[PDB]
Amino acid sequence: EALEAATAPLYNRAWFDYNQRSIVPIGSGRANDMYSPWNYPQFVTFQVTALDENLSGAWSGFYSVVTMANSVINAVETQSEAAKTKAIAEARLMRACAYFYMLRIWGPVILIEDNQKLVDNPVRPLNREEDVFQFIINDLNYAVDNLSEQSDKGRATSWAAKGILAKVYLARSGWNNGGTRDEGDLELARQYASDVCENSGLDLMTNYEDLFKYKNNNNQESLLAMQWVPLGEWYECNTLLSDLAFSTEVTGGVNCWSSYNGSIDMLQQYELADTLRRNATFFTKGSYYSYICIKDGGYTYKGTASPIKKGVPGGPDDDNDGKVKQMNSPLNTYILRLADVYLTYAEACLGNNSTLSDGRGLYFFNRVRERAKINKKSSITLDDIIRERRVEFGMEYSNWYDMVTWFRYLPDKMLNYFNNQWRGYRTDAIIKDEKLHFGKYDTTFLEGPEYYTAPEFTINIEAEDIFLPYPESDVIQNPLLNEPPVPYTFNE
Ligand SMILES: OC[C@H]1O[C@@H](O[C@H]2[C@H](O)[C@@H](O)[C@H](O[C@H]3[C@H](O)[C@@H](O)[C@H](O[C@H]4[C@H](O)[C@@H](O)[C@H](O[C@H]5[C@H](O)[C@@H](O)[C@H](O[C@H]6[C@H](O)[C@@H](O)[C@H](O[C@H]7[C@H](O)[C@@H](O)[C@H](O)O[C@@H]7CO)O[C@@H]6CO)O[C@@H]5CO[C@H]5OC[C@@H](O)[C@H](O)[C@H]5O)O[C@@H]4CO[C@H]4OC[C@@H](O)[C@H](O)[C@H]4O)O[C@@H]3CO)O[C@@H]2CO)[C@H](O)[C@@H](O)[C@@H]1O
Ligand SMILES: [Cl-]
Numbered sequence: 167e168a169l170e171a172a173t174a175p176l177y178n179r180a181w182f183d184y185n186q187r188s189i190v191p192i193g194s195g196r197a198n199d200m201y202s203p204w205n206y207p208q209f210v211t212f213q214v215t216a217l218d219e220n221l222s223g224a225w226s227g228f229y230s231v232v233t234m235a236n237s238v239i240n241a242v243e244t245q246s247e248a249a250k251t252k253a254i255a256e257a258r259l260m261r262a263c264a265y266f267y268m269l270r271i272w273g274p275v276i277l278i279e280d281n282q283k284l285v286d287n288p289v290r291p292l293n294r295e296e297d298v299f300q301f302i303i304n305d306l307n308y309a310v311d312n313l314s315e316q317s318d319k320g321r322a323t324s325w326a327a328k329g330i331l332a333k334v335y336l337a338r339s340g341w342n343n344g345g346t347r348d349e350g351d352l353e354l355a356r357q358y359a360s361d362v363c364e365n366s367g368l369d370l371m372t373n374y375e376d377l378f379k380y381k382n383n384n385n386q387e388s389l390l391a392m393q394w395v396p397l398g399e400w401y402e403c404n405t406l407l408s409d410l411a412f413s414t415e416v417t418g419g420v421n422c423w424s425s426y427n428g429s430i431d432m433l434q435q436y437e438l439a440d441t442l443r444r445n446a447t448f449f450t451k452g453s454y455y456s457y458i459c460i461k462d463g464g465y466t467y468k469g470t471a472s473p474i475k476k477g478v479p480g481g482p483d484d485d486n487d488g489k490v491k492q493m494n495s496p497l498n499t500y501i502l503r504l505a506d507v508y509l510t511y512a513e514a515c516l517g518n519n520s521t522l523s524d525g526r527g528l529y530f531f532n533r534v535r536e537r538a539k540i541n542k543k544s545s546i547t548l549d550d551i552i553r554e555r556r557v558e559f560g561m562e563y564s565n566w567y568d569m570v571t572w573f574r575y576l577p578d579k580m581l582n583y584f585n586n587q588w589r590g591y592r593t594d595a596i597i598k599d600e601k602l603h604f605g606k607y608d609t610t611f612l613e614g615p616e617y618y619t620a621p622e623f624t625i626n627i628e629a630e631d632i633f634l635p636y637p638e639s640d641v642i643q644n645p646l647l648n649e650p651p652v653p654y655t656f657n658e
């Protein structure tokens with residue numbers, strides 16, 4: 167039971183190459199959560215090339231998770247029967263997560279149970295999307311059975327396993343399935359998600375803004391998160407700080423450079439009453455914050471833009487216990503929140519119906535709206551769920567993965583949706599009412615699209631743009647990355 171020391175880096179170092187940076191433009195930028203012409207716009211505008219350094223970063227990161235999980239699983243043979251099944255359960259959970267991410271970025275990817283290690287650059291084929299689902303599910307089922315129902319602050323539980331496995335079943339339900347969601351998968355998703363919702367004994371944090379404070383790492387709503395070391399050494403700190411934060415006035419002096427702004431389209435998703443989630447995600451004019459710049463009575467953003475609040479914990483003195491320096495944020499990276507399980511339950515209860523007007527699924531939906539301190543809905547559609555998921559998880563680097571899942575379910579719907587997100591548009595001044603307005607002054611406020619700063623190249627998003635390309639460097643090393651995927655031969 168020094169396994170625990172070997173399974174520990176599965177939460178931090180394993181994910182580092184991914185989390186270092188790429189996680190933001192890919193997870194949140196390609197969803198058009200937010201935007202900058204000078205910080206990797208191409209992900210927002212669908213102009214990404216095979217040479218893109220974020221693709222390389224992300225791709226190595228996820229496979230680093232895979233390598234380490236496989237090292238551990240193997241290592242559990244190169245070294246108590248309950249300590250061992252737990253260790254393997256953690257490795258395979260992370261391995262499922264890494265692939266479930268890749269599956270919704272590239273689609274086909276290479277399925278590796280065995281690292282080889284003797285061969286620097288193995289020539290392995292891509293495996294089919296359905297095989298990648300079945301691999302992820304094999305891993306999650308093991309983690310469901312072999313993780314415990316409660317654990318130490320920061321470690322995985324069987325509730326997390328069930329949580330993920332509910333999202334996976336929901337995502338497979340409609341994937342390439344000819345316009346309908348598979349009822350078998352919908353039922354599987356309902357039962358894993360309702361079992362978490364009803365039996366975990368867990369509860370949403372009363373205040374949504376609390377989720378995103380250092381002092382609240384591994385709260386009861388955090389089912390699975392990247393456990394970053396406060397002021398950690400390289401390979402084990404959260405380096406996203408300087409990329410997220412727009413000005414030193416919100417970092418207690420620490421160096422930063424973010425030019426990201428919440429997108430027109432993203433800011434428009436927030437209902438008029440939904441300002442607790444909006445505030446906790448982006449700064450907008452007038453927005454007050456008691457827990458940032460605590461020394462000066464709190465910070466009030468007084469600009470006309472939409473810089474990122476979420477992932478910007480404030481200064482080292484702003485209840486962060488001094489754990490804030492450049493490229494060193496003390497926040498965990500969320501992977502799965504209980505809120506996500508609530509919405510996932512809901513979507514799985516909607517199923518193939520137009521509307522959902524009753525049941526426990528709608529209860530856990532409204533339960534999320536309840537926390538945002540906004541009005542419940544008496545019935546919901548898929549479009550409500552999409553919108554609720556966007557505002558709930560804005561700037562948590564996961565809205566793109568969901569949009570890919572949806573695109574895989576209703577491709578023409580979502581292509582029309584991607585093309586009506588004002589992608590690449592921006593506006594001089596976002597001003598606030600008594601309600602958000604988008605435009606500019608000109609010598610008096612000019613409102614609407616006509617006064618947006620429009621992109622000046624072609625943006626016509628089509629099916630082949632959605633999944634990103636394989637990183638060119640890897641393609642050169644393994645030419646099968648250009649060939650059709652093949653069926654994986656599963657192990658029994
Ligand atoms: O035009 C009209 C219009 O204009 C408007 O204005 C615009 C303007 O036009 C536009 O130019 C502008 O653009 C900005 C942009 O918005 C901004 O974000 C960007 O900033 C960059 C910074 O300048 C730059 O310093 C920063 O550098 C960091 C790297 O990005 C980062 O990857 C790197 O990390 C290193 C790490 O440092 C190192 O420690 C590490 O070492 C490890 C080692 O690897 C281990 O092996 C070992 O174990 O441990 C070691 C550590 O212990 O390796 C990492 C990389 O792998 O860190 C650097 C900086 O780091 C530090 O050290 C070096 C010191 O010199 C430095 O001081 C110190 O910080 O990158 C920023 C952007 O980053 C990334 O994303 C963007 C992309 O382009 C980059 O390629 C990418 O790197 O700057 C530009 C401009 O310069 O926006 C303007 C508006 O704001 C007007 O407003 C309008 O009116 C006009 O009309
Ligand atoms: Cl693209």
Ligand code: NA
Nearest residue numbers: 585586587588
């Ligand atoms: Na359009």
